[PDB]
């Protein structure tokens, strides 16, 4: 245990002194979950779940949305109200501070040291109570999140299967709804403490400025509803923008997958044009969003100026000509800031409260939704026509029981009913932890060994037996990681047969009596199914005398079982055995590049405008200082001039930040796209897709959403802090020399913070990722988990995960409180010293009263500007560190005028090729020649070098040696664009990117309609194309199920037809295609290609047999042969015929 909050001295419970040791150790050694503590018994999943379920029980025994609400209320009780009362007392003392400022200012102009030390004490106490309030509220919220999370997970166990969309709604119910609830519980005490704050503020300012005060008290208040309105607009804009963004991502996911396909003919620019077309729409939305952001930032600092303007001008020169002592004006200034700070929070509080109300309504709607069988009766509804009718079945021990029938006869339904999964209406069923593999296979977010063990102690002989008996070890070794390979989400990097074999292995490996397998032979061949039923079923299951109940439909399994079960229309037609059935019927460089992408045009326009705005904001008060003592009319007019300058300059600065941020986002995205386009193929193959896709998915989005606002806030905070320091220095010179020590202290407080605040931050992210994912895994494979009776262990795992999340999200708020309190203590020390120097120096000797006003008013508030500064600095640093990876990604004609000849005669003399710079060579002394108009075949085993030969023919490998030519022409003087408008290629991996048929046939779109129609008619595709809406305009999706595999290859051949390269490369147009269709495909491609030399590569016999010139790829080299009928009998059918 390390997080000891409840077990320390009640002084440190306030000032967080126990964090000194943690943060000092954290500076040196990197924090981790082993270096972190464990949550106390006072706050776990179990404790909060216990209190919440006790309250829910006491409320439901007296029987809903209001019910769950009151249950949470009575369950979390005293802590929340304690935080709220801390908060209101702090608010009172904060409203009290400026009045003692006023008293001091009065006394010196006409008992003040006492007021100064009282101000010091009241500041420190008020801020301490505020911080304790924040922390207690945050901890209550974290408790509530853990509690309702484990509660809705407990509910996930008892729900019914009849209720895809529900899974997404469940995981949003944990990712956004629960966060809304918890953040609303953060802001709950603020909603109680805001009204008393504004009421005390208005009544206090009225008694200081009189009737005029009221007028001012209106203006500031009028900003609070307006703000809300602005916020709403933002939200609307956000929605629209998000939509566009999503679409863009889709149009990217294709390009970053058909990489080799894309670059094999250089259609990449054609798709980049479309990608840029989407980007402009996205940019257009962003303008309005940033305009609203600018309006918000503008009002933020405009209302403070406007209040003082329309109040002071409307007080003296309007109403009663009352002499305005410096105390009145400066107290009004202080109260204006102390009231502006809370006003913004009310809008966000209202939004958070309504959103939390909706989310709790949603949570309530969700949260409240032998083997003997005699008289089976049930259905998939609380009321409806039944599908289970009159089923009586006995499943004795040690007996193979097949279930056979037609499609839709209640086979798997009977399986789940035997499981107890479906509580039958009227019937009896008796038989426990039963192993079960469902029809649709499911996996976890873990390794292969883990999925097959499934929380079971590992075995050597047992596990190796199960691995070998499932025909799974070779394909397991085929994976990039021989074992312990991280199986992707749902098994994207695996095939269906592998998932099925893993599921069957999981079912077989578990030690239990009963095993169900819902058709485990649907995605398996004949050989693998035979070996599985022989070794794993009849030899391994039948070994330990288990009760195997397998449902399938084959021939070999019928005489191997004991009981045959025939189902028809949900009824057992006949029953018995076989015989009874047959006898019956971050450095400054990242920011430097970020701002230099904007250019010199806007950098200075931003910086100098900010400097001038802050200079105006200080000069207005500097002139007010001389205004005070008493040409009052001229004074007020100068005040009005300054007030106007301030607001105009603020609007200018905001518009500048907006425009600059948008331009930078534009240029950065375009440069990233362009630099990713020109990368080599081996680079794309080396780097995983997640990192390349992820930068565009988030980095871009993150920057656009948060960099401009956070940068603006950081700049405003730092300049306001520097201005306040300069003010309190100019007021009292000696005070300056006292403030530089303390500020240096802050430097030491800075380092130790960041080197931990960053760390904890990332830890939070990590504990958020496997938690949510875990949830999803439980939802899909719910039947398997309720069948294995493994609910207890999984609930244990989820309590573990939510504890690991809460400890991180708790240490983070503890560290934020630490930095806050210490920076605030120093911000109170500085105002203490400033007032103590001002009372003596500026009164006893200097005798100038306009000074102390400015100094006190700025030192009463310097601390909040300091805190804004430091927090925004931390955020800007993490965001700039996120940006740096974008730059890391950023750093990755004599024969032309003569038309490319149709003579396909080529010759590659002494060719070699390597993949990486200075690695093992792929080819060795490759010499070959190809005659015009002659079909060429190439053979070889896997890894022989035929794909490498094709890629080198398209010079896709960047370490080839020798000279390679086409009609005396090579790659020494031609750019890539000409090199891709000269040859055609059909890859083994076909794809149909989204769009219309015109976008797939000719994405360039140069070709005319009759040309595409003829290409479809020749490619045996015109009839199915005419059977679609519109014709040549069917909206296709990436991959999908809109066309057959043969039709995808027909589209590839149509691409080849329209390419008109006159040279064709056929890279395994045979794999994963039915022979009945592949043979007619090759016949069409032969009858269509009488000219325009084609070089093919495959592992089929007849394809290699039909080619004229063929070269057998040896271990490292090739051996070519010209006449096909001569080399297939010269070696006496040893190396070229039986191999083919
Ligand atoms: C902006 O301040 C305020 C100023 C005045 C008032 Cl009347 C209220 C607040 C205020 O904020 N309302 C209290 C509720 C609240 C929410 C966030 C913060 S916080 O400081 O930003 N964040 C943390 O402490 N920890 C986070 C919490 C989320 C998980 C990760 C760690 C502090 C407090
Ligand atoms: N989880 C479910 N929720 C609601 N209805 C279901 C569910 N599973 C199946 N059904 C319905 O129950 C009917 C019968 O389903 P099955 O028992 O799976 O068909 P079966 O032919 O006996 O076995 P199969 O096809 O190998 S899974 C279908 O028409 C479905 O609409």
Residue numbers in the entry: 215 to 277, 283 to 329, 354 to 406, 411 to 616, 678 to 739, 768 to 921, 996 to 1040, 1060 to 1321, ...
Question: Which sentences did the original study use to describe this structure?
Answer:
ATP-sensitive potassium channels (KATP) are ion channels that selectively allow potassium ions to permeate the cell. Specifically, they are inhibited by ATP and activated by Mg-ADP. Previous studies have established that the functional KATP channel is a hetero-octamer composed of four inward-rectifying potassium channel 6 (Kir6) subunits and four sulfonylurea receptor (SUR) regulatory subunits. KATP channels in pancreatic islets are composed of Kir6.2 channel subunits and SUR1 regulatory subunits.
During cryo-EM data processing, 3D classification demonstrated continuous conformational heterogeneity of SUR1 in the ATP + GBM state. Specifically, four peripheral SUR1 subunits wobble around the central Kir6.2 channel in small angles. This greatly limited the resolution of the overall cryo-EM density map and deteriorated local map quality of the peripheral SUR1 ABC transporter module. Further improvement of SUR1 map quality at the ATP + GBM state benefited from focused refinement with local search on symmetry-expanded and signal-subtracted particles of the SUR1 ABC-transporter module. The map of “the isolated” SUR1 ABC-transporter module reached a resolution of 4.4 Å and demonstrated markedly enhanced quality, especially for NBDs. Instead, a previously unmodeled density inside the SUR1 central cavity in the ATP + GBM state map has a distinct elongated shape that matches the GBM molecule in an extended conformation. In contrast, this density is not present in the ATP state, where GBM was not supplied into the sample. This unambiguously demonstrates that the extra density inside SUR1 central cavity in the map of the ATP + GBM state represents the GBM molecule. More interestingly, we observed extra density on the degenerate site of SUR1 NBD1. The shape and size of this density matched that of ATPγS. Therefore, we modeled this density as an ATPγS molecule.
